[PDB]
Design a protein around this ligand. Structure first.
Ligand SMILES: CCCCCCCCCCCCCCCCCC(=O)OC[C@H](COP(=O)([O-])OCC(O)COP(=O)([O-])OC[C@@H](COC(=O)CCCCCCCCCCCCCCCCC)OC(=O)CCCCCCCCCCCCCCCCC)OC(=O)CCCCCCCCCCCCCCCCC
Ligand SMILES: CCCCCCCCCCCCCCCCCC(=O)OC[C@H](COP(=O)([O-])OCC(O)COP(=O)([O-])OC[C@@H](COC(=O)CCCCCCCCCCCCCCCCC)OC(=O)CCCCCCCCCCCCCCCCC)OC(=O)CCCCCCCCCCCCCCCCC
Ligand SMILES: CCCCCCCCCCCCCCCCC[C@@H](O)O[C@H](CO[C@H](O)CCCCCCCCCCCCCCC)COP(=O)(O)OCC[N+](C)(C)C
Ligand SMILES: CCCCCCCCCCCCCCCCC[C@@H](O)O[C@H](CO[C@H](O)CCCCCCCCCCCCCCC)COP(=O)(O)OCC[N+](C)(C)C
Ligand SMILES: CCCCCCCCCCCCCCCCC[C@@H](O)O[C@H](CO[C@H](O)CCCCCCCCCCCCCCC)COP(=O)(O)OCC[N+](C)(C)C
Ligand SMILES: CCCCCCCCCCCCCCCCC[C@@H](O)O[C@H](CO[C@H](O)CCCCCCCCCCCCCCC)COP(=O)(O)OCC[N+](C)(C)C
Ligand SMILES: CCCCCCCC/C=C\CCCCCCCC(=O)OC[C@H](COP(=O)(O)OCCN)OC(=O)CCCCCCC/C=C\CCCCCCCC
Ligand SMILES: CCCCCCCC/C=C\CCCCCCCC(=O)O[C@H](COC(=O)CCCCCCC/C=C/CCCCCCCC)COP(=O)(O)OCCN
Ligand SMILES: Nc1ncnc2c1ncn2[C@@H]1O[C@H](COP(=O)(O)OP(=O)(O)O)[C@@H](O)[C@H]1O
Lengths: 98, 347, 54, 40, 320, 56, 459, 107
C-alpha cells in the first residue's frame, strides 16, 4: 500500500472530521460532504486504473453523477431553511429535540 | 402534492429498496440506497411546515453521511481484494466502517439521535413509512454479510440500543417519540441475533413491522398525537382504545400475545451458543418498554379521562375513510403465537 | 409493619429501581436537539470503535 | 359509592412537554396542536 | 365512487366548474338586523344557495334525520339561559359560544364542499370570521374570563388557518337605539334583557377590528339600514367589483383538490375543536361523559353506521 | 312456544355440545397412541377368541 | 382433558350471545356444570399419572387444584353480581370474558406436561388479572397496585425462561416425565447455583416469600372482590405447584441452598402474623394472613419430605377456600358500610346473626381447628419441620398463637360489642350472600371426611 | 376571583339503591323479580342439589384405583408365606446382590 492511497484516506478522514465538527454554516457541512465525495472519486479512479479493471471505469462517473444529485437535493433543503429563518446557522434547527 | 407524483415517489422508494435487496454488486446496492434517500425526502415534506423541513434536513444529513461511509468501506474492500460481489468482507477496517454505515442507516445507538426528532417533526403517515419500510434494505445487507461482522461490535451496539430505547421511552409524552424509541429498542433486540441466526432476525422484523403498522394505523384512525389527545378517544370510539391496549400489551412481550414470539425465540438461539448473560440483560431491559406501554394503556383505555363538551358534535359523524388491512394487522400482531413453528419457512 | 414493610422493604427493591430508572430516563432523553453535539458524539464513537474493537 | 376516575388534576400530569420535569426543562413548551409554527 | 385521489387522477378537476359566479359571500350584521332578509334576497337574485345561520342544533340537521336531538345530547347549552343569566355560575356563556363557533365551522366546511363539488356559489350569515365579536362583547362585559378568550383564540387560529376567506363581505349597519326599538318590537321575552352596552360592544368590535381586517384582503360593502332594503343596488355592487387581491386567484387545481379533501371528512374539520385544555366551562367529568354517551347511543339511528340500523328500517343488513 | 324459545334458549346447548366434542376429541387423540397396545411387558395378554384389540 | 377445556372455551360464545338480563344465570349454571365434569379427574391411581395425551397429563397434585379452580368461578360470578348492577351489558360481558379466560389459562397451566408450555400459560394468567384489577377497581391506587403486581412477577419470572431454554439445550427435553426419569445430580458450582436461583426465584416471588410480598397487600386491597378471591385462592398456588414440580432437578444443591429461604419464611411468618394484629383494614389483614400461610407452605416445600409435600397440598387447598370465604365476608360488609375499616362498623352480630355465624366458622377454620384440613396440613408441616430440626417448633408454636390471636381479634372487633350508632343502612343479608358463604364452607367440612383426596401424590 | 370554584361538570354521586325497598323478597340477585327468583332457583339447585350432593356421593364411591386393598392382600400373602417358611420377613436389600455389580477398588 503506497503513500498515495494513505494520503487519500487521510484526506477523506479529515473531511469527515470537518463535517462532524459543525461550527456553523450548514453550507460548510455540504462542502465537507462533497470533499469526502471528491476523495472517494480520486481513490476509486486510482484503484481502478492501477489494476486495468477496464469494465470498472464506469464506476467513478456513475458515482459522481449520483453524488452530485444528492448535493443538489441538499442545497434545496438548505435554501428552505434560510427562507424560514433568514440565515443558515446550524443552531437554529432546535425545534425538534429528544 | 399531486397524487400521481406521490405515487411515483412511493414507487421509486420501493424500487430502490428492491434494487438493494435483489442486487449482487456493491455499486448497485449503493445506487439503490441513493435512490431510496433521494425519493424519500419529499414524502417527509408532503405537509409543508418548518418542523417537517428541519426533520427532512436532519434525515438527509444523516443518510448522506451513512452513504458516504458505506462507499468508502466498499472502496477499501475493493482495494484489499478486487471483488465487487457482496460476500465476505475480506478486510477488518472495511467491515467496521460498513457496520457503522449500516448502523447509521438503521438507527442503532449511539447513532440513534436522529430517529426521535425526525419522527416527531414529520407526520404520522410519513413516520409509519419511515419506521417500517426503511429498515428492510440495511437489514438485508447486514444479513447478507453476517458471517463477516464482528460479534463484539454488533452485540455491544445492540445492547446499547436496547438500553437507550428503554430509558428514553419513559420520559416522552408525544406518541411519535415513544414510537421512535420503541423502534430503537426493537432494532437493538433484532440486530443482536444477526451473528447467530438471520432467520430469527427476519422473523423479528416481520413481527415488529406488523405490530408497528397496526399501532400507527390505530393512531391515524383516532387522530391523536399527544397522550391527552389519545386519552380523549374513549369517548367516541372505545373499540379503538381497547384494540390499541391489546396491541400495546402485545408489543411489550407479554405472552400469549404474538409479541412474545420473537424475544423468546431469539433468547433460545442465543442460549444455543452459550450466551446467557446477554439475553437476561435484554429481557430485564425490555421491562422498561413494557412499563411505558403500560402507562400509555392506563392513560388511554383502562381509565376514563375527562372529556370536552365539543366532543358531542363528533358523536354524529363517522370515519369517512377506512384503511384496509387494519383488522388483519391487529390479528397478526396479537394472536399468532400458536403458529410459531411456521418460522421454519425461512420467512 | 411501618419500619420494615412500609419503609425499608419498599426502599430496597421497588423504590430504588424507580429512582434509578427515572434518573437514567431524565439523563438520556435530555437532548437540546442540536446536531452539532450529535455529530461530535458520532465522531467520538467512530474513533472509539476504530481504535478499540481492532 | 362511585368508582374513582381521573379528574383534571390527575390529567395535567401528562400534559407537559416531558415527564418528570426538571429545572433545565421547566422552560420547554409543548409543540403546537397542529405541527405549524408562527412565521415570525 | 366518492371523491378521492383516484377521481382527481382520472377526471375530477374542480377548476373547470368555477365560472366566475361562485363568489362565496357572507352577510354579517348586528343582533336583530335585516341581514337575514337581505341574505335571502342576494341568494335568490344571484342564483346562489343560501345557508341559514348556524344555531345550536345545526349539526343535528345534517346527520341522520334533520330533527334536532335533545339539548343534553347536542350542545348542553341554551341561549335563553345566557340572556337571562349572562353571568351564570355554571359557565353557560362559554359553552354556548364554543358550540356556536364549532357549528359555524362545520357550516363553512359544508358550504365550501358544496361550492367545490357543484360550482354553484353560496351565501352565508356570520361565518367563523366575525364570530369573535360576540366573544369580545362577552369578555368586555365581564361574562367570561381571560383564559376563556385565550382558549377561543387558540382554537380559532388552529381551525381557521386552513380555509379561504369569503370573496365578498356585506355589512348592514344599524344604530344601537334603532335595534333596541326593533328588539322591543320583536316580542321575544328574553331579548329585551339585552343591555345596550352589550350591543354597543358588539358594534364597535365589528367596526374597529373585523372590518379593516376584511378590507385589507377582501371587498367590503358597508350598508346602512335604508340602503340595504334595495337588493338591486346590492347585486349591482356585487357584480361591479372584481376580486383580484385575495388568495382565490392564486389557487390552482392541486390546492383546490387538497381543500376539497379537507372540507369533506368532517372529523378532521372538527378535530381541533376539542384540544386537551381543561377549562371548567367546557370540560366534562368521566362519569357525565360516559352517561351522556351511553344515552346518545340508545337513539334510534345512532347505534351503528348510517346504513346498518335495524330499528330505523334498513334491510339486507347481512349482505351490506 | 316451539321455534320461539329456540331463538332465546339456543345458547344453552353450546356447553354440552362442547363437552361431547371434547370427549370425541379425547378418544380420537387416544387413537394415536396405540403403538404399545397389548405389547406391554407387564400386561401382555393372549387375545380372546372374539377380541380384536385389548382396549380402544 | 379436552372434555374440560372445550366447554370452558364454549362458555365465551355462550356468554356473548346471551340476553342482556340472563348472562349471570347462564354463566353460573354452566360453570357449575363444568365443575361436575372436573370431579372425574380426582380418581387418581397410585401409579404414575393420568397421561391423557402428549400435551396434557393429570396427577393427584393437579387434580385438587383443578377441581378448586373449576369450582371457584361460580362463586366469583355470584360475588361480582352485586357491584356490577349499574354496569352496561358490554362491560359485564367483558368482565365475564376475563373471568372465563383466567379459568381457561389456569386449567391449561395446571396440567401442562411440558415446562415451556407451563411457563407460557403461567405468564398468560397475568393479563386478565391485571385488566380486572386496573379496570373494575374502586380506589385510585389500583393503577399502582397493578404495576406492582405485573413487575414483581415478571422480574422474577424472566430469568426462568432463560433457565428453561438452557435446560432444554443441555438435557434435550422439558417434558416432565422425561425430566423426572432422567434426572441427574447438580454439582456444587457457581453456574449451578445461579441455575437454581433462576429456577426457584420465579416461583418464590409469586407465592410470595417474605421480603418480596409488597405487591400482595396492594393487589388484594385495590382489586374488586372476584380478583381478590382468584388471587388468594388459586393464583398464589401457582408458585407452590411450580416449585414442587421443578425441585426434581435441583437436588442435591437444595440441601444447602434452602437456608436463606427457610430462614426468611420461618421469620416472615412471625412478622406477618404480628403485623395482622395491628391493622386498620380488613382486606389488608386477610392478605397478610395469606402471606403467613404461604410462607409456611414455602417452608414445607423446601424441607422436601413426603409429609412436607402432603401437608403443603392440604394447606394449599384449605387456605384457598378459607381466604376466599374471608374476602367474601369482608366484601359483604364493605358493600353496606362503603368504608372498608375494621373499627368503623361494630357489633354487627346483633343486627346480622347468620353472617355472624359465617364469620365465626370462617375464623375457626382459619384458626386451624381440628379436624379441619387446615390443621391437617399445618400439623403435617409441623411434624416434618420438627424432623428437620427440633428448634423449629418454637417458631411454629409462636405462629400458631399469633394466628389464633389475630383471627379472634378480627372476629371480636367486627362482631361483638355495641353497635355503632350513626349507621342505619345495615339491611338484612340477602340470600345470595348466605348461599355464597354456604358454598364456600361446606366443601371444607366435606373434605375433612376424605383427606386422601387432597394429600397429593406422596400419600 | 370570579372563578366558579367548580373544577369540571360532574354528575352528583348517586345514592345506593336498596333492593328491598322496591321489592321485598329480593334474594339479592337482580332487580327484575322473575329473573331474580329463577337465578336463585338455578343457583340453589345446581350448587347444593346437583354438585354438592351427587358429586360428593360420586367422590365417596370412587373405585379403588390407588390399590389399597390390593396392597393389603399382597402384604397378607407375603407375611403368611414368610412366616410359614421361617424367612426373616422384610429384606434389608431392596435389590438382590448377585445382579448388582460393584466396581472394584483394590486400593
Ligand atoms: C413486509 C412488507 C412491509 C411493508 C412496509 C409498510 C408499507 C407501508 C408503505 C405503503 C405506502 C403508505 C400508504 O399508502 O399510506 C399509509 C396507509 C394509511 O392510509 P392513509 O393514511 O389513509 O393514506 C394517506 C395518504 O397520505 C394519502 O395519499 P394520496 O392523497 O396522495 O393518494 C394517492 C393514492 C392513490 O393512488 C393513485 O392515485 C393511483 C394512480 C396511479 C398512478 C400511476 C403512476 C405510476 C408511474 O396513492 C397512495 O396513497 C400511495 C400508494 C402507493 C402504491 C403502493 C403499491 O397505511 C397502509 O397503506 C398500510 C399498508 C399495509 C402493509 C403493506 C402490505 C401488507 C404486508
Ligand atoms: C359435635 C358433633 C355434632 C354432630 C351432629 C350433626 C351436626 C352437623 C353439622 C355440620 C356442619 C354445620 C354447617 C355449618 C353452618 C351451620 C348452619 C347454620 O347457620 O346454623 C344455623 C342453625 C339454625 O340456628 P338459627 O337459630 O336459625 O341461627 C341463629 C344463628 O345462626 C346463631 O347460631 P348459633 O349460635 O346456634 O351457632 C351456630 C353453630 C353452628 O355453626 C358452626 O359453627 C358449625 C361448624 C362447626 C365446625 C367448625 C370448624 C372446625 C372444623 C370441624 C370440621 C368437622 C366436620 C365433620 C364433617 C361435617 C360434614 C358436613 O355454631 C356452634 O354451635 C359452635 C361450633 C363450634 C364447635 C367446636 C367443636 C368442633 C369439633 C367437634 C368434633 C368434630 C369431629 C368429631 C370426631 C370424633 C367424634 C365422632 O343451627 C344449626 O344448624 C347448628 C348445627 C349444629 C352445630 C354443629 C357443630 C359441630 C358439628 C361439626 C360437624 C359434625 C361432625 C360429625 C360428628 C357426628 C357424630
Ligand atoms: C405476523 C407474522 C408475519 C406475517 C407476514 C405477512 C403474511 C402475508 C404474506 C403473503 C405471502 C408471503 C410471500 C408470498 C409467496 C411468494 C414468495 C416466495 O417465492 O418467497 C419464498 C420465501 O417465502 C417466504 O420467505 C415465506 C413467507 C411466509 C411468512 C410467514 C412466517 C411467519 C412465522 C410466524 C407466524 C406464523 C404465521 C401467522 C399467519 C401468517 C422464496 O424464498 P427464497 O427466495 O428461496 O429465500 C429468501 C430468504 N433468504 C434470502 C433468507 C434465504
Ligand atoms: C344411587 C346412586 C348413588 C350414586 C350416584 C352417582 C351419580 C354420579 C353423577 C355425577 C357424575 C359426575 C360427572 C362425571 C364426569 C367424568 C366422566 C365422564 O367424563 O365420562 C364421560 C361419559 O359421561 C356420561 O356419558 C355423561 C354423564 C354426565 C351427566 C352425569 C349425571 C348427572 C348429570 C346432571 C345434569 C343436569 C341434570 C338435569 C338438570 C335439569 C365420557 O366417558 P368416556 O371417556 O367415553 O368413557 C370411556 C370408557 N368407557 C368406554 C367404558 C365408557
Ligand atoms: C431481600 C428479599 C429476599 C430476596 C432473595 C434472598 C435470597 C438470595 C440469597 C442467595 C443465596 C446464597 C448465595 C450464594 C450461596 C453459596 C455459599 C456461599 O455464599 O458461601 C461461601 C462463598 O464465599 C463467598 O460467599 C463468595 C460470594 C460473595 C459474593 C456474593 C454476595 C454476598 C452479599 C450480597 C447480598 C445481596 C443479596 C440480594 C441481591 C439483590 C462459601 O465459600 P466456598 O466454599 O469457597 O464456595 C462455595 C461455592 N462453591 C462450592 C461452588 C465453590
Ligand atoms: C343442621 C343440623 C344438623 C343436621 C344434619 C344431621 C346429620 C349428621 C351428618 C353430618 C356429619 C356426620 C358424620 C357422618 C359421616 C358418614 C359418611 C362418611 O363415612 O363417608 C365419607 C365419604 O364422604 C366423601 O368421601 C367426602 C365428600 C367428597 C368431597 C368432595 C366435595 C364436593 C365437590 C365440591 C367442590 C370441592 C372444592 C374443593 C376441591 C378440592 C367417608 O368415606 P369412607 O369412610 O372412606 O367410605 C365410604 C364408603 N366406601 C367404603 C364404599 C368407600
Ligand atoms: C439494566 C437495567 C434493568 C432495568 C429493569 C427495569 C425494571 C422494570 C420497572 C421499571 C420502572 C421504572 C419507571 C419509573 O419508576 O418511573 C418513575 C415513576 C413515576 O411515575 P409515572 O407514572 O411514570 O409518572 C407520573 C407522574 N408524573 O415512579 C413510580 O411511580 C413507580 C410505580 C411503579 C413501580 C414498579 C416497580 C416494581 C419493580 C419491582 C422490582 C423489579 C425490578 C426489576 C429488576 C430486578 C433486579 C435484578
Ligand atoms: C422480585 C425480584 C427478584 C429478581 C430475581 C433476579 C435474580 C434471579 C437469579 C439470577 C438470574 C440470572 C441467572 C441466569 C439464568 C440461568 C442460566 C444458567 O444457569 O446458565 C449458567 C450461566 O450462569 C450465568 O450466566 C449467571 C450470570 C448472572 C448475570 C445476571 C446477574 C443478575 C443478578 C445476580 C444476583 C441476584 C441473585 C439474588 C437475587 C435475589 C432477588 C433480588 C451456566 O453458564 P454456562 O455458560 O453454561 O457455563 C458452563 C461452562 N462452565
Ligand atoms: N356566538 C353567539 N353567542 C350568543 N348568541 C349568538 C351567537 N351567535 C348567534 N347568536 C344568536 O343568534 C340570534 C339570531 O341572530 P340575529 O341575526 O341577530 O337575528 P335574526 O336571525 O332574526 O336576524 C341572535 O338572538 C343571537 O343572539
Amino acid at each position: 500500500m503506497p503513500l498515495v492511497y494513505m494520503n487519500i484516506i487521510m484526506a477523506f478522514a479529515i473531511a469527515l472530521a470537518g463535517l462532524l465538527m459543525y461550527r456553523s454554516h450548514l453550507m460548510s457541512s455540504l462542502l465537507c460532504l462533497e470533499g469526502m465525495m471528491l476523495s472517494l472519486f480520486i481513490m476509486s479512479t486510482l484503484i481502478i486504473l492501477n489494476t486495468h479493471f477496464t469494465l470498472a471505469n464506469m464506476m467513478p462517473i456513475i458515482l459522481l453523477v449520483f453524488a452530485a444529485c444528492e448535493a443538489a437535493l441538499g442545497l434545496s433543503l438548505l435554501v428552505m431553511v434560510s427562507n424560514t429563518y433568514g440565515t443558515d446557522y446550524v443552531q437554529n434547527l432546535n425545534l425538534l429535540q429528544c | 402534492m399531486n397524487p400521481i407524483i406521490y405515487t411515483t415517489l412511493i414507487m421509486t422508494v420501493m424500487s430502490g429498496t428492491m434494487l438493494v435487496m435483489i442486487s449482487s454488486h456493491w455499486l448497485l446496492i449503493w445506487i439503490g440506497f441513493e435512490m431510496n434517500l433521494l425519493a424519500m425526502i419529499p414524502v417527509l415534506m408532503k405537509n409543508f411546515n418548518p418542523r417537517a423541513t428541519e426533520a427532512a434536513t436532519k434525515y438527509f444529513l444523516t443518510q448522506a453521511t451513512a452513504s458516504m461511509m458505506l462507499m468508502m468501506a466498499i472502496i477499501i474492500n475493493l482495494l484489499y481484494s478486487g471483488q465487487w460481489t457482496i460476500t465476505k468482507m475480506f478486510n477488518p477496517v472495511a467491515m467496521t466502517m460498513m457496520t457503522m454505515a449500516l448502523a447509521m442507516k438503521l438507527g442503532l445507538s449511539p447513532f440513534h439521535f436522529w430517529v426521535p426528532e425526525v419522527t416527531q417533526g414529520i407526520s404520522l403517515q410519513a413516520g409509519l413509512l419511515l419506521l417500517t419500510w426503511q429498515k428492510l434494505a440495511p437489514l438485508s445487507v447486514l444479513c447478507q454479510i453476517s458471517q463477516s461482522i464482528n460479534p463484539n461490535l454488533m452485540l455491544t451496539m445492540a445492547m446499547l440500543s436496547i438500553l437507550i430505547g428503554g430509558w428514553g421511552g419513559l420520559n416522552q409524552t408525544q406518541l411519535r417519540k415513544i414510537m421512535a424509541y420503541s423502534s430503537i429498542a426493537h432494532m437493538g433486540w433484532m440486530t443482536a441475533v444477526l451473528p447467530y441466526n438471520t432467520t430469527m432476525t427476519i422473523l423479528n422484523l416481520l413481527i415488529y413491522i406488523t405490530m408497528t403498522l397496526a399501532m400507527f394505523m390505530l393512531l391515524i384512525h383516532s387522530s391523536a398525537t399527544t397522550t391527552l389527545s389519545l386519552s380523549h378517544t374513549w369517548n367516541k370510539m372505545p373499540v379503538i382504545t381497547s384494540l390499541m391496549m391489546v396491541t400495546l400489551l402485545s408489543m411489550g412481550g407479554l405472552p400469549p400475545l404474538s409479541g412474545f414470539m420473537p424475544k423468546w425465540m431469539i433468547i433460545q438461539e442465543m442460549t444455543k451458543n452459550e450466551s446467557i448473560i446477554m439475553p437476561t440483560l435484554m429481557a430485564m431491559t425490555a421491562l422498561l418498554n413494557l412499563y411505558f406501554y403500560m402507562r400509555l394503556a392506563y392513560s388511554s383505555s383502562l381509565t376514563m379521562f375527562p372529556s370536552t363538551n365539543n366532543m358531542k358534535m363528533k358523536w354524529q359523524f363517522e370515519h369517512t375513510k377506512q384503511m384496509k388491512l387494519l383488522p388483519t394487522m391487529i390479528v397478526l400482531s396479537t394472536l399468532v403465537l400458536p403458529m410459531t413453528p411456521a418460522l421454519s419457512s425461512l420467512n | 409493619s411501618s419500619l420494615l414493610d412500609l419503609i425499608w422493604l419498599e426502599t430496597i427493591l421497588p423504590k430504588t429501581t424507580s429512582f434509578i430508572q427515572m434518573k437514567m430516563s431524565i439523563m438520556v432523553s435530555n437532548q437540546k436537539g442540536l446536531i452539532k453535539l450529535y455529530f461530535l458524539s458520532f465522531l467520538i464513537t467512530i474513533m472509539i470503535s476504530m481504535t478499540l474493537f481492532n | 359509592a362511585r368508582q374513582w376516575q381521573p379528574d383534571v388534576e390527575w390529567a395535567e400530569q401528562f400534559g407537559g412537554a416531558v415527564m418528570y420535569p426538571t429545572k433545565e426543562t421547566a422552560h420547554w413548551k409543548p409543540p403546537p396542536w397542529n405541527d405549524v409554527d408562527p412565521p415570525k | 365512487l366518492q371523491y378521492g385521489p383516484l377521481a382527481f387522477v382520472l377526471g375530477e378537476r374542480t377548476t373547470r366548474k368555477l365560472t366566475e359566479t361562485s363568489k362565496v359571500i357572507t352577510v354579517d350584521g348586528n343582533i336583530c338586523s335585516g341581514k337575514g332578509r337581505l341574505a335571502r334576497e342576494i341568494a335568490e337574485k344571484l342564483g346562489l344557495r343560501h345557508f341559514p345561520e348556524a344555531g345550536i342544533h345545526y349539526a343535528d340537521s345534517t346527520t341522520g334525520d334533520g330533527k334536532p336531538l335533545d339539548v343534553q345530547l347536542s350542545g348542553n347549552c341554551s341561549l335563553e339561559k345566557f340572556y337571562d343569566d349572562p353571568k351564570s355560575n355554571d359557565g353557560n356563556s362559554y359553552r354556548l359560544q364554543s358550540w356556536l363557533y364549532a357549528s359555524r365551522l362545520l357550516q363553512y366546511a359544508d358550504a365550501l364542499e358544496h361550492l367545490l363539488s357543484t360550482g354553484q356559489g353560496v351565501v352565508l350569515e356570520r361565518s367563523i370570521y366575525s364570530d369573535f365579536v360576540f366573544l369580545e362583547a362577552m369578555y368586555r362585559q365581564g361574562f367570561i374570563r381571560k383564559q376563556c378568550v385565550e382558549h377561543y383564540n387558540e382554537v380559532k387560529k388552529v381551525t381557521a388557518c386552513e380555509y379561504l376567506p369569503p370573496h365578498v363581505v356585506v355589512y348592514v349597519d344599524v344604530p344601537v337605539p334603532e335595534i333596541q326599538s326593533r328588539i322591543q318590537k320583536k316580542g321575544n321575552p328574553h331579548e329585551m334583557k339585552i343591555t345596550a352596552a352589550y350591543l354597543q360592544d358588539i358594534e364597535n368590535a365589528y367596526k374597529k377590528t373585523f372590518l379593516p381586517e376584511m378590507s385589507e384582503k377582501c371587498e367590503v360593502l358597508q350598508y346602512s339600514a335604508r340602503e340595504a332594503e334595495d337588493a338591486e343596488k346590492v347585486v349591482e355592487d356585487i357584480e361591479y367589483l372584481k376580486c383580484d387581491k385575495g388568495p382565490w386567484p392564486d389557487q390552482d387545481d392541486r390546492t383546490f383538490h387538497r381543500l376539497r379533501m379537507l372540507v369533506q371528512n368532517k372529523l378532521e374539520v372538527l378535530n381541533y375543536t376539542t384540544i386537551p385544555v381543561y377549562l371548567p366551562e367546557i370540560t366534562i367529568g368521566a362519569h357525565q361523559s360516559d352517561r351522556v354517551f351511553q344515552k346518545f347511543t340508545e337513539l334510534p339511528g345512532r347505534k351503528y353506521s348510517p346504513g346498518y340500523n335495524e330499528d330505523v328500517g334498513d334491510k339486507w343488513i347481512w349482505l351490506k | 312456544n316451539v321455534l320461539q324459545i329456540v331463538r332465546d334458549h339456543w345458547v344453552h346447548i353450546l356447553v354440552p355440545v362442547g363437552f361431547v366434542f371434547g370427549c370425541y376429541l379425547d378418544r380420537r387423540s387416544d387413537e394415536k397412541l396405540t403403538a404399545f397396545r397389548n405389547k406391554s411387558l407387564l400386561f401382555k395378554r393372549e387375545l380372546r377368541p372374539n377380541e380384536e384389540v385389548t382396549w380402544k | 382433558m379436552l372434555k374440560i377445556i372445550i366447554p370452558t372455551t364454549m362458555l365465551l360464545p355462550m356468554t356473548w350471545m346471551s340476553k342482556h338480563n340472563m348472562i349471570w344465570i347462564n354463566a353460573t349454571v354452566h360453570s357449575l356444570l363444568i365443575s361436575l365434569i372436573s370431579l372425574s379427574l380426582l380418581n387418581q391411581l397410585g401409579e404414575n399419572s393420568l397421561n391423557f395425551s402428549l400435551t396434557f397429563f393429570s396427577d393427584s397434585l393437579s387434580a385438587p387444584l383443578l377441581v378448586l379452580t373449576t369450582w371457584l368461578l361460580p362463586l366469583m360470578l355470584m360475588a361480582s353480581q352485586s357491584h356490577l348492577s349499574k354496569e352496561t351489558t358490554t362491560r359485564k360481558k367483558l368482565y365475564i370474558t376475563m373471568l372465563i379466560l383466567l379459568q381457561l389459562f389456569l386449567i391449561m397451566t395446571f396440567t401442562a406436561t411440558e415446562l415451556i408450555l407451563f411457563y407460557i400459560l403461567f405468564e398468560a394468567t397475568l393479563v386478565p388479572t391485571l385488566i380486572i384489577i386496573t379496570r373494575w377497581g374502586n380506589q385510585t391506587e389500583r393503577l399502582n397496585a397493578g404495576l406492582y403486581f405485573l413487575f414483581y412477577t415478571l422480574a422474577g419470572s424472566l430469568p426462568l425462561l432463560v433457565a428453561l431454554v438452557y435446560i432444554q439445550n443441555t438435557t434435550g427435553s422439558l417434558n416432565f416425565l422425561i425430566i423426572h426419569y432422567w434426572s441427574h445430580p447438580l454439582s456444587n458450582s457457581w453456574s449451578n447455583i445461579f441455575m437454581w436461583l433462576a429456577c426457584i426465584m420465579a416461583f418464590m416471588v409469586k407465592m410470595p416469600l417474605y421480603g418480596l410480598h409488597l405487591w400482595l397487600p396492594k393487589a388484594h386491597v385495590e382489586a374488586p372482590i372476584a380478583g381478590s378471591m382468584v388471587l388468594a385462592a388459586v393464583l398464589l398456588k401457582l408458585g407452590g405447584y411450580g416449585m414442587m414440580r421443578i425441585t426434581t432437578i435441583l437436588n442435591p444443591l437444595t440441601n444447602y441452598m434452602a437456608y436463606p429461604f427457610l430462614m426468611l419464611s420461618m421469620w416472615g411468618m412471625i412478622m406477618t402474623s404480628s403485623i395482622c394484629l395491628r391493622q386498620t383494614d380488613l382486606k389488608s389483614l386477610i392478605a397478610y394472613s395469606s402471606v403467613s400461610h404461604m410462607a409456611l407452605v414455602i417452608v414445607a416445600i423446601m424441607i422436601q419430605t413426603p409429609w412436607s409435600f402432603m401437608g403443603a397440598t392440604a394447606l394449599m387447598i384449605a387456605h384457598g377456600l378459607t381466604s376466599s370465604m374471608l374476602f367474601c365476608l369482608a366484601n359483604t360488609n364493605y358493600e353496606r358500610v362503603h368504608s372498608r375499616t375494621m373499627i368503623l362498623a361494630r357489633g354487627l352480630q346483633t343486627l346480622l346473626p347468620l353472617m355472624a355465624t359465617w364469620w365465626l366458622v370462617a375464623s375457626l377454620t382459619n384458626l386451624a381447628l381440628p379436624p379441619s384440613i387446615n390443621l391437617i396440613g399445618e400439623l403435617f408441616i409441623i411434624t416434618a419441620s420438627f424432623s428437620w430440626s427440633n428448634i423449629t417448633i418454637i417458631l411454629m408454636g409462636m405462629n400458631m398463637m399469633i394466628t389464633a390471636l389475630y383471627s379472634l381479634y378480627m372476629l371480636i372487633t367486627t362482631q361483638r360489642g355495641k353497635y355503632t350508632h350513626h349507621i342505619n343502612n345495615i339491611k338484612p343479608s340477602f340470600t345470595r350472600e348466605n348461599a355464597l358463604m354456604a358454598l364456600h364452607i361446606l366443601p371444607l367440612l366435606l373434605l375433612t371426611l376424605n383427606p386422601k383426596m387432597i394429600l397429593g401424590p406422596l400419600y | 376571583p370570579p372563578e366558579p370554584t367548580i373544577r369540571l361538570q360532574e354528575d352528583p354521586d348517586p345514592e345506593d339503591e336498596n333492593l328491598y325497598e322496591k321489592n321485598p323478597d329480593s334474594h339479592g340477585y337482580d332487580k327484575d323479580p322473575i329473573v331474580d327468583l329463577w337465578n336463585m332457583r338455578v343457583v340453589f339447585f345446581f350448587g347444593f342439589s346437583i354438585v354438592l350432593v351427587l358429586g360428593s356421593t360420586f367422590v365417596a364411591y370412587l373405585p379403588d384405583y390407588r390399590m389399597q386393598e390390593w396392597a393389603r392382600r399382597e402384604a397378607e400373602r407375603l407375611v403368611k408365606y414368610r412366616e410359614a417358611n421361617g424367612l426373616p420377613l422384610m429384606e434389608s436389600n431392596c435389590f438382590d446382590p448377585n445382579k448388582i455389580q460393584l466396581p472394584e477398588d483394590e486400593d
